[PDB]
Amino acid sequence: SDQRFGDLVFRQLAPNVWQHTSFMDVPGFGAVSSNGLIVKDGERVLLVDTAWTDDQTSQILNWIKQEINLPVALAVVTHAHQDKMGGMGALHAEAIPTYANALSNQLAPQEGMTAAQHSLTFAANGWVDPATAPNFGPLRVFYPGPGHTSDNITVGIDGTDIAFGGCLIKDSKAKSLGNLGDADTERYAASARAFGAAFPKANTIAMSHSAPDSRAAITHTARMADKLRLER
Template sequence: MRHLPVLLAWLFFAPCVHAQTPQKPRLVVTPITNHVYVHTTYGVYQQSSVPSNGLIISTQGGVVLVDTGWDTKDDTGNTEQLLRWVADSLHQTVRLCIVTHAHEDRVGGIAALRRAGVRVISTPLTAQKSIRLGYESPEGILPSDTTFTVGQVPIRCYFPGEGHTSDNIVVWLPNQHLLHGGCLIKSVATFGMGNVADANLGEWANSVRRVIRQFGTARTVIPGHEDWSDTRALEHTLRLLAKYNAQKR
């Protein structure tokens, strides 16, 4: 995967850091098709810098984001950079954001989006969980399986069952055969399950199998973290789950 760094001027004014600890850019945007991009922002998990992936979908009716930048309650800078990138690079406004579950790498930037007048939606469960975690709540309006169109681009939001969390959804772009699997799906570049604090390890594999049945024709599969590929990521997730659960027995 090749990343396209954007908005990096701030690096030249940042304090110098040791050569062995290079500073990550706040935002990386990578084109996938002419009108779909992956936005990657960075957060800290277990004292390591971890990339988090979302989507930028450019339509005739404005831009749709899938997931906010990875922000905290005190710092919404990643999502603010994302909004600036859309304005400066696409010369469009963000019309809508779909968040895929209630963790800070998905909902952390809702406050920044609301300040910018962006509508943020998800499922009722994600809305409830966001409030409990102390984040602003998306509008909990999405049913478990729905397709809507923005600027002539169909977007399907699908809840396959519990897995990484009880509320994780995936987003399917049928015109591009592109699946945003979010944190339900593991990158082929990863060899561990990551954050399983809110996981349903007994149902996760069944949920991935439902995703395979629904979206097995995907040409591109975007996981929540690390590099993306194709449907190999779905099978890789099943293998990781089988190994992890076997070790727990």
């Protein structure tokens, strides 16, 4: 099912939903992959994350024009890390409206990243403000709280069984919580469970550093963060 296109891999998770995977050689971590989503919303395309680099992101757009042949109406990025906003200049070069958490845009220059042109705000219940996320269609953006970072957001797709956890959620067989450098060890547990409650009917949990998994990935991440909470 994994379709190869250039330096990336593409997999169809559902009708109108695809997963794009880019690879990067972290020096002390081997060849680490990162996943994003491509959503066909009627006559337009919605992108849920970029690749590691500008070059890999332009390969994503070339795949969209090749396979779907529809304009990319908007692009959301889940937090300010290389695997998520590394291809921001590639999306801005094609005049694609980019959206991110307001904190992610404040943090992007601190890590050498191009901030998104629009900033998302959120209500007290973690859901995105409709004034900041216009015409998102099926995209349901949810802020579960500080976890993997302090700005990580999640996205769900209506009409589908799919909810995207980004780097907050790891697969049910993960032996660790991944990159904990920018993590909130206290709220990670409650944030992982908040993401599971925001999308209760989503049994296909997609994430950045793992293949799509069931909802056991949510509880396994929460239990892992439960022990991380008491170790700090």
